[PDB]
Symmetry: D2
Subunit: 255 residues, 4 copies
């Protein structure tokens, strides 16, 4: 079924995770046709500034995510940054996420694949659509069975990203495709006004799921404040994409 990956950008506190988790649980009950996966990072490994928020550590993060899975019975996903983190994370993560900048790091991919868990690789801003084939092959070599490729924008000049929707049908040739509606509109080193419009495009073209970061009060988020979606708007956007998908799916090309 259609996948929806959502949650707060960073694990600011398990309290925050539980609040967002509650709403995601509710939506989960309202849209039985959709598979929800709760996402949150235990560490922001590449903030621009050394003085910005990174997180509270892997242990605190895995624990908080554990609380969410136990308290709401929701699937979990979080990203790893070095090979050694794959094993401890796979304890609670149903899907291991590979950061865009690290999509080419062979050891990280193999470490993730070895855990037996599903792997979702964010397509690097520097990577061409057809070059993701090699990424998938590495993961298969490492034993991965459930593989996802996430479109999150491509470098377009300086401090700007563009979404080349031709990438969706191309990557679909070798993996399930997810569209990241949050980071695709960000300006490296973004405009929330473009999040919904581009999400509509993604489902009209055809993808296997959408990725969206949401926060009760984006204004106060410790990361991606200007792009995280207000929690109260999540339901409406999901309903909208299911409606558009229902109609457009009739024309999705056979890949």
């Amino acid at each position: 079924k259609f996948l929806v990956i959502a949650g707060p950008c960073a694990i600011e506190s398990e309290e925050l995770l539980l609040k967002v988790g509650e709403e995601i649980k509710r939506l989960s009950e309202k849209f039985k046709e959709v598979e929800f996966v709760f996402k949150s990072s235990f560490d922001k490994a590449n903030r621009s500034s050394i003085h910005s928020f990174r997180g509270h550590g892997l242990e605190y993060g895995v624990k908080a995510l554990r609380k969410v899975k136990e308290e709401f019975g929701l699937k979990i996903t979080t990203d790893i940054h070095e090979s050694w983190q794959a094993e401890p994370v796979a304890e609670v993560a149903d899907i291991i996420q590979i950061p865009a900048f690290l999509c080419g790091q062979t050891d990280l991919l193999l470490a993730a694949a070895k855990t037996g868990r599903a792997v979702n690789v964010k397509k690097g801003q520097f990577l061409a659509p057809w070059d993701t084939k090699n990424v998938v092959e590495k993961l298969k070599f490492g034993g991965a069975k459930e593989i996802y490729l996430t479109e999150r924008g491509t470098t377009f000049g300086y401090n700007n990203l563009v979404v080349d929707f031709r990438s969706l049908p191309i990557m679909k040739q070798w993996a399930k495709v997810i569209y990241d509606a949050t980071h695709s509109v960000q300006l490296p080193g973004g405009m929330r006004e473009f999040i919904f419009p581009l999400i509509r495009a993604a489902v009209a073209v055809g993808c296997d799921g959408v990725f969206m970061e949401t926060h009760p009060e984006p204004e106060k988020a410790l990361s991606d404040a200007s792009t995280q979606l207000p929690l109260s708007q999540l339901e409406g956007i999901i309903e909208a994409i299911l409606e558009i998908r229902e109609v457009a799916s009739k024309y999705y090309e056979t890949i």
Copy 2:
């Protein structure tokens, strides 16, 4: 608002080809009554890569052929101009005067089109940022244009490649009606037909005021853009699909 569909053969290879495509467009206009069809075809391809490629049969012949289409089928007409002097004669048959992408900044050409009293559709240059189309519209308004369109046809992305930045649609909608060019946006400067349909679906899901599509009875035999012109028999199905997606997505279109 009535959705605009601009379609027709890339070039006026012959008056016969035009009537053949025109006949099909006329039939679709009778079916899709919620759509405003505009027949398009260039009397001249002024910037073919090679000096040896087909350009056309001249302005006189072209206007004459386009007039035959309007007279026989009662369809609106659009064609592009390349120099200021062409605006007047072309305005005699063209309901919408098209401004080529490479020429979207030529002040005199814009002014020439504007003073004819006809609608003007400017192809956004492959080098132009979406927010910079504001001054292009300002020039047209200054010149007397009352009905203005901006067409998204891709942006330079490395060498011999174009990418469609759909953020341009809501941005340009701030100052003009927006049209999505489904044919030229997938061509590799100096074409990939498999991406025509998916990208047009994205355009209507995002929200635009119309779509531009070149169609030919037999693309394979086309004298220009043979790789991207849509087979005529496929037009009806594409239009039905974009109307369906437009309908379901419409309640979510943001207000400017």
Copy 3:
């Protein structure tokens, strides 16, 4: 010999042209090894705003340029924007310049070639280096014998241009290459601080000439105010590029 095309961006007045022309004449006498060509546009056909300065017309422009050629005996070059302007311009212009946005307009190229004059085509911001071969062929078809291709930057994201120096050796395969030091640093819709550094790169790589707009008081220019080079700095930059060229020329690849 090495070509140096210089002059004020636009013909603000024949007075301005004579002042710049005087200095160019002087430099002409100081550097006999260089072929100087005076440049100035009689019309800025694509200003962003309808309210910006365009010029005083073709007649006034051709007349002013005529005064410069007669009073100083300097070669002349100016750009045309529509086919009909080719003939009247060729009366005084030794080199007819084709604007970057119009480098693909067949009739404009043929009209310029038919005049018998030399033709310098500014490479479009949208054009790939290898695609200039077709441009040259069009001009040869039209009778052109002396053909130049000018590097002036390539579209790089929005409102930015990058100079891919690989273009110099590539275009050299079919025409003489000129490097435009002024427009290459401009930000469409620029930083004067990068003009000199990039000029040095151009001569180190290897070109047949340089193009530079200069004005007695750039601060007061009616066009390209932030990028035109102060007249007083022209001599030093020219001396610098001749010195660098003298040394680097030993390594210019055989094309």
Copy 4:
């Protein structure tokens, strides 16, 4: 200031290959006394496109081979790290710790290199703007780095292509010494050796603190970057040329 030349085989294919290249570099260091040579070679290619491509013989073997080069030729050494834990062992032989382009933003890796007390050279990411390297340097300084370098190795320009924006050299010089990577800047992601020499000439004419060049006795047989590694016999001539261009251009280098 003493010009820096970082050179060596892309990968440590064997300790034998290293000594062969090292011998030539040692000879050039005796001739070009105004140059500070640093021998470079990766103990691991952690991001080859294919899982089937050559990666290396391990960290232990690599450090051992690099140590043999330093001991036998008395040359400075540099190699890249891919994860935080590698910084300590690598710092035992490496005078300069290199940070891969894709990893230029990984805070922990930067911090790990910085606390070793060794110099750190960060390859500017293909996705990073020149002005955004300021925070990368800030992180290193925060971590204890006293000698920092930023290497220009090209920027993403469309698909499978990189362009070198030479404006980056004077921009990055504001906060660190700048090195120009002559090998990777001409490679087509997922190589054009004919552009290596001309672009390196541009780099020195613009002004940099050093150049980075991969060289192999027989590029054709290289296990990595066989298309762009410079034939060893050509190194001397390239170095002489950049020193000559640097000299003549130097009086014109702008002050930061």
